[PDB]
Design a protein around this ligand. Sequence first.
Ligand code: SF4
Ligand SMILES: [Cl-]
Ligand SMILES: [Cl-]
Length: 303
Amino acid sequence: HHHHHMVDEILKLKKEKGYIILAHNYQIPELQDIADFVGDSLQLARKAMELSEKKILFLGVDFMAELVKILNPDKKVIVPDRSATCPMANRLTPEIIREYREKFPDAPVVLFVNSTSECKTLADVICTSANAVEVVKKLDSSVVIFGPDRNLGEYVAEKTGKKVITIPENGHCPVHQFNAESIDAVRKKYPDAKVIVHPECPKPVRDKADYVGSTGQMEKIPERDPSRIFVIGTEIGMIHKLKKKFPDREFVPLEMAVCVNMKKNTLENTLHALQTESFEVILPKEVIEKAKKPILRMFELMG
Ligand code: SF4
Ligand SMILES: [Cl-]
Ligand SMILES: [Cl-]
């Protein structure tokens, strides 16, 4: 009854106070269901650019809320838990970027969107899981600096044939460290299922999958693949999203994988956020201006 109370009050306050709710794919299902749009980080930031509303309640982690703010600088962006963050992103530092630029000055700095806003001010181009191959393909250089995810960087090297210098050392997402034995098991249990895993997964997992793709790419695979069962190698929130879009398919987690930071957002603190209209995401004007440069370069490459 309190969830119904909270859901009803959340819906009431968002209309009353003029908020659009954007939720990342990895939010708990109860928050996905009250959001106006559910998607990946860049998808939500670009969706916000289209909106006539000027107030956004963002449900994800801090670098994503900040990406919304960078591309929507004149909108008020609030989050329910100001400590929700990406530990992988936080392991890459300005000092490491500057060190590697000095070592490899002819190598463009390609930063995965899962990166701090401060790191973005130092990057030559931003990329996402879905466009990293195309972005690195179109760059002039046969060598790039790439971070913060080593698995994604090595996947890009495989697909482009280019040299990819990854930073920091052992940059990785703990959520996507499935083991390849999980794929061996599902091949036995569901011999006709299609296995889709994220490019942030380790190479033995990527190489055993039917598809490697971002969450956005996962959402599009059943549009062209009629298989009845998909096994999904990413954070558990995506199962809810996929089942909602394709109710006549079955979606099976490769393993249970939970991002603790994504789960910091709850109905209760989401309600608190609408009641208090906090916590506002604020970036210095200078950070927004500098971080926009590699984001626009990414838009330009994607043509
Ligand atoms: S799922 Fe991994 S990459 Fe995404 S926010 Fe959580 S820790 Fe960071
Ligand atoms: Cl704006
Ligand atoms: Cl993520």
